[PDB]
Design a binder for this molecule. Structure first.
Ligand SMILES: CCCCCCCCCO[C@@H]1O[C@H](CO)[C@@H](O)[C@H](O)[C@H]1O
Ligand SMILES: CCCCCCCCCO[C@@H]1O[C@H](CO)[C@@H](O)[C@H](O)[C@H]1O
Ligand SMILES: CCCCCCCCCO[C@@H]1O[C@H](CO)[C@@H](O)[C@H](O)[C@H]1O
Ligand SMILES: CCCCCCCCCO[C@@H]1O[C@H](CO)[C@@H](O)[C@H](O)[C@H]1O
Length: 180
């Protein structure tokens, strides 16, 4: 059993962008993929989503992709590619929106999406056991440690706590709906 298409394409896209960032520098890549940072860019629609493809350190991309691989992979396998796509698009948009509102357009990474997937997988398994999806008891602990690491700034994750709560809200909301 291997990761499905959406899980895989996202991971490779993040690695490619990360490489581009090491070669050209973070600033040059953000210039092209960051949330619109000037009126002149408000209609370059890819920017409302591409911010999620940029990571600023090895630990940042390492842990984001591990969680995405595990959670996103599980969602895609058991619920389908369509499900992962919607959770991803919505959480990326909302967390990106909240982040820029309070901290500006210079940010990036899948942490908002990971918070969404954590909330979704955990809640879906708690309310809808026979759905087949759930967050392994032991992994809940390390998810909490990862959450705490970002919350108290012990680990730089680009995005602020408010943005992460927005991503989490999306996952919980969708899990609630799916267990309805
Ligand atoms: C503490 C860091 C977070 C935990 C990371 C756990 C990663 C587990 C990855 O498992 C892999 O997932 C794929 C998609 O679900 C499966 O196709 C594959 O067979 C399986 O080997
Ligand atoms: C986005 C991931 C967030 C994970 C937060 C989940 C909170 C779980 C911590 O509480 C524990 O929950 C278990 C299952 O609900 C109970 O068996 C246990 O008694 C309780 O101590
Ligand atoms: C520094 C972070 C290192 C974390 C290492 C965690 C190893 C244990 C994770 O096991 C994974 O658990 C999943 C859910 O049970 C399985 O689906 C998957 O196949 C399995 O590989
Ligand atoms: C509920 C906790 C809210 O946390 C706050 O969320 C804002 C929005 O991201 C950040 O600007 C700020 O630093 C952080 O303290």
């Amino acid at each position: 059993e291997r990761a499905g298409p959406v899980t895989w394409v996202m991971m490779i896209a993040c690695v490619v962008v990360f490489i581009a960032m090491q070669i050209l520098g973070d600033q040059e890549v953000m210039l092209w993929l960051a949330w619109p940072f000037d009126p002149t860019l408000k209609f370059e629609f890819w920017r409302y989503f591409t911010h999620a493809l940029m990571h600023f350190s090895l630990m940042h991309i390492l842990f984001n992709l591990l969680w995405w691989w595990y959670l996103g992979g599980a969602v895609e396998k058991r619920l389908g590619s369509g499900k992962l796509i919607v959770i991803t698009l919505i959480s990326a948009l909302l967390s990106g929106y909240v982040q820029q509102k309070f901290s500006g357009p210079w940010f990036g990474g899948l942490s908002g999406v990971v918070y969404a997937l954590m909330g979704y997988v955990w809640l879906r398994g708690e309310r809808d056991p026979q759905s087949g999806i759930y967050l392994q008891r032991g992994l809940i602990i390390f998810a909490l440690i990862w959450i705490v690491a970002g919350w108290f700034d012990l680990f730089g994750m680009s995005m602020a706590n408010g943005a992460h709560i927005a991503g989490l809200a999306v996952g919980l909301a969708m899990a609630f709906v799916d267990s309805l």
